Amino acid sequence: PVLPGVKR
Amino acid sequence: DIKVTPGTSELVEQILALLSRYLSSYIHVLNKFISHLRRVATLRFERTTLIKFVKKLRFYNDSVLSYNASEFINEGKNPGADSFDKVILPIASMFVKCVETFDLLNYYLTQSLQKEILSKTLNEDLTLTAESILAIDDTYNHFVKFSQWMIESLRIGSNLLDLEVVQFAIKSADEDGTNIGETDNIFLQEILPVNSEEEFQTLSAAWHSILDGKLGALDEEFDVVATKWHD
Amino acid sequence: DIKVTPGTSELVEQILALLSRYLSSYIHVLNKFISHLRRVATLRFERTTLIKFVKKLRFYNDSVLSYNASEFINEPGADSFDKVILPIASMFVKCVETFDLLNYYLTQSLQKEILSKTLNEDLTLTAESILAIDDTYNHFVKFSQWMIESLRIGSNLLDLEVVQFAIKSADEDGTNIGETDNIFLQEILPVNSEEEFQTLSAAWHSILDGKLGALDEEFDVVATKWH
Incomplete structure (x- = not known):
């Protein structure tokens, strides 16, 4: 799950 | 700070359109369900509860569709102008109110009502x-x-804009001490600050594609479950 | 006189379904029109008139889709067939006259108002x-x-204005005693049995669905025009 503007 | 760009009005309209499809998808599938509960007398009052929820979603929807972004955004020369986080504040505020409303509707519909149907109708x-x-x-x-x-990206965060589920995940992780900070929970994943509207628009489009994907999949499952209530 | 046969209950539902699509066609396309007149301030009050009409169409539609035909029919001494059809025919008459009022406003009055106010098409x-x-x-x-007419349940309280107008206009003119292209003057043959009604009804069903299908088409292209 790669959400933009979000540091996983 | 960040000042607005000429394409700000359109960006706002796109983001609100996301929420409109979210609401409408619910209004569509619930109106079908409400119409079907009319023949089941034992669920007479659970029906009226859902009706109250739909009306709230309807109002949330025809308010989104009526909102003209260009009316509340002063551009001028690229000033004097509206700060960019000023025009986003009531948008995110709208999302929060709708999201928390969904959280209420989702629980009742997917947990409480489900268990009540099995208890009253004795079938599925x-x-x-x-x-x-x-x-x-x-x-x-x-x-x-x-x-x-x-x-969070525009740093317009406060206790008044906090979503409950995010705040629950934070404190639940703060208690159990989870962990190194891997992390699997999306509510625990930090938000990188935006330094320009040109970056906000780009990242918004990235979300716009993702949210439409989930919305598209949501429309699919509503079609299937509306088929099960055929007659 | 004709007594009802077991399959009458489904014949009734089949007839009301026809009226239900007729209503829903108008309800569907007018919802698009009303939702677009919201952005045109000069047609604010013309929009509220349409909302009133649509609400009325919604009611006629919700009443038809809720009517359980088997709740009002019994079948040696059962229900006479014409007596179970009268409420259906009465419903059609009430809806038709409503359409007539709505049609005139939507086709005549509103179109000339829109041309006068917006100065374009x-x-x-x-x-x-x-x-x-x-x-x-x-x-x-x-x-x-x-x-x-075919079931001999006619009176003055089931007359349609456009029919009675066509008859009076004919008897006053000259196209009275002719075969005439006008469908309103053509005589109706009295149905002899339950089966004959049920067959001719399905024949009307084929025709009216065809008209309704064509109506659905035109409604889709006019909604496009309102982009």
């Missing part, structure tokens, strides 16, 4: 599929995360 | 859609006449 004709429930959560969790993104 | 109905409006109307009228 009018229950939600396990496939649809996952679509409900998957869509909700991302609209939550997107709402959080609009707020 | 960006919100007007196409000439083809208007033709489908009347052609559907005229055939639903005729079908409403056939149901009433």
Whole structure:
């Protein structure tokens, strides 16, 4: 799950 | 700070359109369900509860569709102008109010009502599929995360814009001490600050594609579950 | 006199379904029109008039889709067939006259108002859609006449204005005693049995669905025009 503007 | 660009009005309209499809998808599938509960006398009052929820979603929807972004955005010369986080504040505020409303509707519809139907009807004709429930959560969790993104990236965050589920995940992880900070929970994943509207628009389009994907999958499961209530 | 046969209950539902699609066609396309007149301030009050009409169509539609035909029929001494049809024919008459009022406003009064206020045709109905409006109307009228006349349940309280106007205008003119292209003057043959009604009804069903199908088409292209 790669959400933009979000540091996983 | 960040000042508005000429394309700000359109950006706002696009973001609100996301929420409109979110609401309409619910209004569509619930109007079908409400219309079907009319023949089941034992669920007479659970029907009226859903009606109250739909009316709230309807109002949330025809308010979104009526809002003209260009009316509340002063541009001028690239000043004097409106700060960019000024025009986003009531948008994210709208999302929060709708998201928390969904959180209320989702629980009643996917937990309480489900258990009440099985107890009253003794069968599973009018229950939600396990496939649809996952679509409900998957869509909700991302609209939550997107709402959080609009707020934290522009640093317009406060206790008044906090979503409950995010705040629950934070404190639950703060108690159990979880962990190194891996992390699997999206509510625990930090938000990178935006330094320009040109970056906000780009990242908004990235979310717009993702949220439409979940919304598209949500529409699919509603079609399937509306078929189960055929007659 | 004719007694009801077991399959009458489903015949009734089949007839009401026809009226339900007729209503839903208007309800569907008018919702699009009302949702677009919201952005045109000069047509604010013309929009509220349409909302009133749509609400009325919603009510007629919700009543039809909720009517359990088997709740009002019993079947040696059972229900006479015409007595169970009268409430259906009465419903059609009430809806037709409503359509007549709505059609005139939507086809005549509103179109000339829109031209006068907006100075362009960006919100007007196409000439083809208007033709489908009347052609559907005229055939639903005729079908409403056939149901009433063939079962001999006619009176002054089930007369349609457009029918009675066509008759009086004919007897006053010269196209009275002719075969005439006018469908409103053509005589109705009295149905001899339950089966004959049920067959001719399915024949009307084929025709009226055809008109309704054509009406659905024109409604889709006029909604496009309102982009």
